[PDB]
Structure formats: structure tokens, C-alpha cells
Symmetry: C2
């Protein structure tokens, strides 16, 4: 099990009250790897090294070092024996070799005893000489790190003097793995350069918490960033990490901008700047511009344009439909202008969804006529969000595995089309079952609008959406070149986009009106008198 | 005065995750509160706690005694064997029980042993305590027929029944988790009016913007399991949210600009560029030029314009006790020079600054400053005699207006120019990281607006974003700097000269940065 010098599985650390300084840390460490540990103060960098040291065992998950290796650890604040001298503290580091020399003098002294076994002496002496690979080395190391005099008490030493001693011991022990917490503190520039050289040529594994960018750029072959107490391994040095950090910031800036834009659209409406269909039908041609729609592609939600709509879209004449013994619609007539967004309201079971199924040709009227224009291509999106297999992902659900989809008449990357429904790269592998009813609503929308129709029949797309999606949807629809008919009980949504209203009343009565929800209610009140808006059913 | 209070309320969910943490909120009678947040922010848990259902929590969650709370969860809980009528009747059972008692009283008049007074008195209390209110209610929410069995109702119908029940109960406080689900438009408008006219407290989790804009006078937004109350309706909240995204956008652009400056240097490898920095001396000293740097992550006060005569050191000798620190040092510093200072500790690095500052005196030789030179010394210590003070207090001394250099300016603005944002400014010195204390120390001592900065190890404990920001700010500084530092990247980026303190009082002066010096050192001395 030497393939990894250290492993962590779901490692965490809780500090009272219940704060986690680290969470879900799953990482593998390779022998010889040189890793720089980055992260803001409080990201748990130091705790992480204490765990690898074997000092902190009170953790979640499992933290295992390679078996039978030497681990050296440098805390931020050195731990030395105030009574020892510098000489003695350093000599503790080379105990392994000092003990060899002592044993070797014994072996040599054993040669003079007639009961000694030559072969065993010579063999052990050989095994002792094999280990050696001193007083001059210590002097050499001592100079390198500017150590205080050999005779100095640890007590008398400064904090920086103690650090240099602790550092020198560690390097002289030559462990398999060096764990370094801010090793450049209290050192001078040429010493740091010397340290970098040592760390660079060091044959074992180095995990260093440091701000020193020459370390990170010239030694570090991996950057381990700690953020929310979670680990972000990055393969490469400081420079390439820095480039990655920049792109990540540019992405973040891009995502908030897209969404600051969505919010500002609603703000204009709110300010207010009204009083979008007294204007919508007039500027229809402006929406049908190819260059114009190409700019809306970076909007939070972007609905694909259908084929160009003609003047005649939907003509319904004396429409009549019943279900069982219940009259749903009687004598309904209307024409839908191109560009119109028609909000549909009324009590459930009034036959609202039934109209869609009839325009769609899934059901037949009992009487009357429904006529669509020859340029009309329907996109129906029913109210259900139910998945037969909620183990599939957002992207699998929409694409069916296709990398390239024909969205309407146009081929395009499925990833891009999915992204145009505010499903970011990181969200596309989320399973359907893992999504919120809101998100299940965006997905249902994303899946079914792939047909690229210029006439959208949306049955309650708004029922379960969160505010940001509702706003993005409103905005997307205000930009959509074709027609939409939307069954909804969201009044703000209706007032923002609707050019017309179909109002289902009891006994098969259906009222058609030009305006939004609020305009309709006032008109209904104005004509039916007060108590008109007060709902009434059983 | 409070209908409900919460003190440090939090909730922990497997494995160890915190769905709510540190929730301390007071609720007011009649207040109408809209509850917002992303999925998983703990919205529903919050209402469950206030409902008195979830009782396994941290902190203290307590209703006003005697307060009647009606709670609507996302999924209706109704006995499937009762009729709609029966379910509805349960909400008005107190009124119904009175009607039954009333008829007993009416009958009791005919008995001769009955006390008339008590009957009339009890009758009167029964008028304290109108049946049609049910029809109107069932109408308004469009309930299914009275005879309908709940088991036969759909999800929506059951929600209409459960909601109708709740509003008929006339509680003091309504806690509604997504009440508009599966209603029709006009039904929701009716619900809006009801909750608007409702005299008690309403706490509602909804997405309905007309609710949030017309009814709610407060918006309670949950994010990381923490709550941000906002006083105002949806529209004012939206406006505030926009401004928060503008702020976030600008803080990242500042950070992103700092990164892109260092990216430029990295992508080259480079040279000392002292000639570049000398050629730009005029450009750097332009007042309109420096005005653009004010929005940088770190902004150093420009200082007065440096003349040609800056610093001239000649035959400088200094010892401390028996130990020589400096022997026979000579150098002059051209304007705009940034001098990196290196060497082993105790070699006399800080001592040069104390001599330039005039705190200490040279044993031999001279140090001459030009007339235009104004020092700013920043020592290596981060000690505070009272770590209980905030960042702003430590820098400003409580002054709203500070004289920075020769310029009066808001102290909050000055502090912000050292990357202490508003929320950071109230942090106690003791709460700050070592790197933050070093940024505090700089901000504090640079307030003098010197054109010659004597910086003793400002880089020692700083984090990477700060180091990078500091380098960037030094590259924009119109004046001179001498910086003792053991950060070689920092020195390579900004140093135009190097002072290298060696043993026995030897000090070497070189034009170029650290890497250039070292390569030179290896050329004349060897490895």
C-alpha cells in the first residue's frame, strides 16, 4: 500500500458550537509530490496539516498515512526543550546515525573477543556502513539556516531563532514526508532561497502551507486550495493556478452580470416604466430580427425562436366542448394576433387544459372550429414534472445523450442549449430526483421547448418556479418572437407579459380580453359591478 | 410586544450539516413577513420551528404565551375519511359547540326548576359568541362539494380545504408554507386581500410577487442557513439586491485587476524595469493619473512630489556594542527608487532606517535627505496595546475626517483604500489574522503621506492577495521606498535596487532586483 503516501476519506473537523473548519475532505497524496497549501485565514489549512501529522485524531472520516514512514512536522510555533542546547536539539535529529556510530564502535571492539562471530560482525558492520549515507554536515546545515551558537540554551533563543533550529532538525532527519506550516517565517531571503533549493531536490513528499510564491511556482507541482473548509486540488504550479483563478473570477463575474441584468429588467417595470402588450404587437418585427435574437442568447433564460410567424395564427370560432355531463366551453370565439401572449385563468376543471389539447389536436371539439396558420408550429408544455426515471441527469433528461441537437430548425450543442436554460456546467450532472420542484420546472421547460415552436402552449409552467426563474422566464418571453398562451395563477407574471386574457367562468363561459390581468380585473369589475372579482365555487 | 422571538436558533441535519444557524429574530404583532431564499436555505424548517412542531433545535424559540398559531405546511394533512363539510366544521367547532348549547338553553326555559337569570346570562355569552360565512369561504377558495370525501379529493382540492380551514380558525399568527400552490389567479387575489386585511402576524414562504410587494412590509431572506431581514416590500428588496450585486461585482473586478497585473509579470517570466519606472516618474506623479488608482485593492497615498535630490549616504559607519553593523557604506537613491533590503537578522537592516529617521546616530559618515523628502516609517511590529479596538478605531482614532498627507478625507474612505470593507471595519484587532494585522499596521502608519517609505518587513505575514495588492500599489507609488523583505517574488516584481547586508559590516548596493543581484553575486564571488 505504498502507492499513496497519505489518504483521506470524507475527513472533517468540528469545532464548538458546531462549526466545521473542514468538511468532506477526500484526497490522495503521492510519494514525491510537492504540494502548496493555499486558502484564506480560517480555511482550515493548519488543522489539515495537524491531521496528516497524526496529532489531531478527533475527526470525521478516515485519515491514513502510508504504513511505516517517517513524517516530519513543522508547526507555526516551534516546540523545543527550553533546557536543551542548540547542539543537543540538533543532535536529536541525527540520533539514528549517532546510534550507528556507537554500535559500530561496539562491533569493532567485539573483533577482539574470541567468542565473537566474524561473519556476523563483518555483516553487521556492513549493514551499519550501508546506513551511513557528520560534524561537518551539521556545521554546513547550521550555516545554511543561520543557527545560533551550539552552546545556546533554547530558553534564551528568540522565536525566530527557535524556528531556524526546529527547521534544521527536520531537514536533517530526512523524513519520507515533510509537513510545513509557514516555513519561511523569520528567515532571510537567501535562507529562503536555500530552503527552496532543499525542498526542490528533496526526494520525499512535501506538503507546505506558505505564501511564498517562488516556492509555489518552482517547487509546488500541485496546489491544494481550501475554501469552505473544502479542498480544491489543482494540478500545476502557482502560475497556472493563478490563470485558473482568473478564469474562475471571470466566470463568476459573468454569471452575476447575466443575473443583475435580469433583475434590472424587472426594476424598470417596477420603478415604474410601463403601462408588454400595448407596445408588444407593434414591435413584433423587431423581435424577428436574426441579429437581435442572437444577443439574447446570453440571457439567464433564452427561448429558441421558432419559424417566422404569419399574420394568421389561431382562429377559434364558436368553440364547444364538454366532458361527461359537464359543459367546459360554450360558444367561445377568438383570434390570436402574432406576437400575442395570452394569459389563461380560471378555476381548475373549467377546461383550460382542454383548450390546449384541442388546439394541439389531441382532443376534438364537440362543435366549432379551431384553425391554425400554416406557419404555426406548436410547442406544448403540460403541467406535470413527473420523470419515469429520476436517476437520469439534467443533461441526460434533455439531450437523450445527444451532443448535438436540432433545436427547432437549427443544430447546436446540447450543452449550450441546456445552459441557455440556466443549467450551469456543474448542475448538468445533477439527478432529476435531486432537483427542487422549481428546478424540475426549468428542466421540463428545457426538455419540451426543444421543438422550436413559434406558438407556445404552456400549462402552469409558473406554478413551482422560484422568483429568479419566474423573472428570467418573463424576460425570456418578452423577447420571444412568436406567440405564447400560458395558463397561470401568477398575477405579477401575467401583468408583466400578457397582451390578452382568456378568463374561464362557470357554465362554459369564456371571456377574451385585450390587456393584462389587472386591466382585465378592473374591466370585469367595471362591467359586472362590484363583487365581480370575488371568487365563487361551491 | 413580541409575538415570537428566536435566540441563536439553529438546526442540524445528517450527517452534520447545518440547515439553520445563529437565527436571532424578533417578530411583531401584525407584521406581515415574506420569507425568501434558495431551495435548501431552511425556509420550511424555520416555519416548522415557529409552528412548535420541530422542537429539536439549538438556541431558544419561544412564542408569546396565549398566541394562537395556524400553520399551513406544503403538503396538506387532513383525515381522508371526513367530508369537506366535516373538515371545515372542525375549524369552527367552538362556534358550533355554542349553537348546540344555545338550543339546550332554549329548551331549558320550559322547565320550572331552571334559573331564568342564569339562562339569559349564558344565552348572552353565547351571543359573544352567521352560518353563511362558510358558503362565502368555500366560494372564495372554490372548495369541492360539501359531501366530497377527502380521500377522493386531489392534491389541490385538499390544499384549498386545508387553507380554508386555517383562515376560518382566526388564529393570531398565520404561518404559511407556499399557500398559492394549485390555486387559480382570482383565488390568489382573494387570498392576498385576506392576508392584507388580516390583523394578526403573517409569516409566509411564497414566490408570489404581488403578495411580497402588496402585503409583506418585511422580507426575510435565508441564505447559508442564516437570516437577513429587510424592512420593506419586494420592490425595495429587489432594489437592495441589485445594489448588493453591484457591490459584489466591483469587489471582484478589483481583485481580478490585481490578478491580471501579476499575470502580466508571470507571462513574461522579468527585467528590473527601473528605467521603465524612471521613465514613468512624470506619469506616476500626475494628479489625474493617481486619481484612477484610488479604486485599486490597495492604494498608497501619493506623497509630495520628490525632487532630484533624495537620499545620499556617505561612508556610513555604525556599531552596536562590540558588534559592527555597517562599515563604510556609500550609495545614492534616484527618485522613484524602490530598494529591496536583505540580509541575516542582526546585520543592521532596521538600524539604517532608524538612522535615516534620525532616531539613532551614525558613529561615522553622513546621511543626507533632500528638502522634498518626507519619511513614512513602518516598523515590523504588529503589537497593539489594546487589541479590543476595531480596525477603524485603530486607524482613525475616532476621527471622521483625516489629514492624509496634505489632504483631508473621510477616514472610512481611507481605511477602505487598504481593503478593509465596511463589514470588516468593526472587527477587533484581536480577531484579525496576522496578515490582517500587518495590513492594519501599514494603513495606520502610512497616513502621514510620505514620499519616502521605510518599510521594515511589511511582507512577513501577509497572505498572497495582500502581497500581490501591495506590490501592485508600490508599482503605482510616485515616491521612493526602501523595503526590508525576505519575499523574493515581491522583491523581483518591485525592486529597482538591492541593499545586501553581509557579515562584518559589509553592505552591497546594486541596481536591479533580487534575482539579478544573486546572479551577479554568483558571478563575482561564486557559489
Amino acid at each position: 500500500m505504498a502507492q499513496f503516501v497519505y489518504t483521506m476519506h470524507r475527513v472533517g473537523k468540528v469545532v464548538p458550537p458546531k462549526r466545521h473548519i473542514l468538511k468532506n475532505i477526500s484526497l490522495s497524496f503521492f510519494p514525491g509530490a510537492k504540494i502548496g497549501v493555499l486558502g484564506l485565514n480560517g480555511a482550515g489549512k493548519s488543522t489539515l496539516l495537524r491531521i496528516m501529522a497524526g496529532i489531531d485524531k478527533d475527526i470525521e472520516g478516515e485519515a491514513r498515512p502510508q504504513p511505516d514512514i517517517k513524517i516530519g512536522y513543522l508547526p507555526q510555533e516551534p516546540q523545543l526543550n527550553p533546557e536543551h542546547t542548540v547542539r543537543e536539539s540538533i543532535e536529536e535529529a541525527v540520533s539514528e546515525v549517532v546510534n550507528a556510530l556507537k554500535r559500530l564502535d561496539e562491533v569493532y571492539a567485539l573483533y577482539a573477543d574470541p567468542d565473537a562471530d566474524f561473519d556476523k560482525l563483518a555483516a553487521e558492520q556492513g549493514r551499519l556502513e550501508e546506513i551511513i549515507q557528520l560534524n561537518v554536515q551539521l556545521e554546513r546545515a547550521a550555516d545554511a539556516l543561520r543557527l545560533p551558537d551550539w552552546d545556546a540554551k533554547i530558553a534564551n533563543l528568540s522565536g525566530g531563532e527557535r524556528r531556524r533550529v526546529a527547521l534544521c532538525r527536520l531537514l536533517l532527519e530526512k523524513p519520507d514526508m515533510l509537513l510545513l506550516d509557514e516555513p519561511t517565517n523569520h528567515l532571510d531571503a537567501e535562507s529562503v532561497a536555500w530552503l527552496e533549493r532543499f525542498l526542490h531536490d528533496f526526494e520525499g513528499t512535501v506538503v507546505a502551507i506558505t505564501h511564498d510564491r517562488y516556492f509555489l511556482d518552482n517547487v509546488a507541482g500541485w496546489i491544494l486550495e481550501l475554501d469552505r473548509g473544502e479542498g480544491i486540488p489543482w494540478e500545476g504550479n502557482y502560475s497556472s493556478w493563478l490563470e485558473q483563478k482568473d478564469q474562475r473570477l471571470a466566470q463568476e463575474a459573468s454569471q452575476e452580470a447575466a443575473r443583475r441584468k435580469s433583475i434590472e429588467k424587472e426594476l424598470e417595470w417596477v420603478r415604474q416604466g410601463t403601462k408588454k402588450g400595448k407596445a408588444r404587437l407593434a414591435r413584433f418585427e423587431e423581435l424577428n430580427s436574426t441579429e437581435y435574437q442572437k444577443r439574447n442568447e446570453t440571457n439567464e433564460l433564452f427561448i429558441p425562436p421558432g419559424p417566422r410567424l404569419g399574420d394568421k395564427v389561431l382562429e377559434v370560432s364558436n368553440l364547444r366542448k364538454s366532458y361527461g355531463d359537464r359543459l367546459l366551453i360554450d360558444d367561445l370565439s377568438f383570434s390570436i394576433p402574432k406576437g400575442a401572449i395570452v394569459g389563461i385563468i380560471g378555476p381548475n376543471g373549467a377546461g383550460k387544459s382542454t383548450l390546449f389539447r384541442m388546439i394541439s389536436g389531441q382532443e376534438q371539439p364537440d362543435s366549432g372550429t379551431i384553425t391554425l396558420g400554416e406557419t404555426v408550429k406548436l410547442a406544448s408544455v403540460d403541467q406535470f414534472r413527473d420523470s419515469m426515471d429520476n436517476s437520469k441527469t439534467v443533461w441526460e433528461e434533455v439531450s437523450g445523450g445527444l451532443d448535438i441537437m436540432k433545436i427547432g430548425n437549427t443544430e447546436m450543442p446540447s450543452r449550450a442549449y441546456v445552459g441557455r436554460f440556466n443549467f450551469k456546467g456543474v448542475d448538468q450532472g445533477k439527478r432529476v430526483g435531486e432537483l427542487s420542484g422549481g428546478e424540475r420546472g426549468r428542466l421540463h421547460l428545457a426538455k419540451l421547448l426543444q421543438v422550436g415552436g413559434n406558438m407556445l402552449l404552456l400549462d402552469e409552467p409558473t406554478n413551482d418556479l422560484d422568483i429568479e426563474t419566474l423573472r428570467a422566464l418573463e424576460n425570456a418571453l418578452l423577447e420571444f418572437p412568436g406567440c405564447a398562451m400560458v395558463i397561470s395563477h401568477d398575477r405579477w407574471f401575467l401583468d408583466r407579459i400578457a397582451t390578452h386574457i382568456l378568463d374561464y367562468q362557470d357554465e362554459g363561459k369564456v371571456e377574451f380580453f385585450e390587456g393584462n390581468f389587472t386591466e382585465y380585473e378592473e374591466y370585469k369589475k367595471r362591467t359586472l359591478g362590484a363583487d365581480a372579482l370575488e371568487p365563487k365555487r361551491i
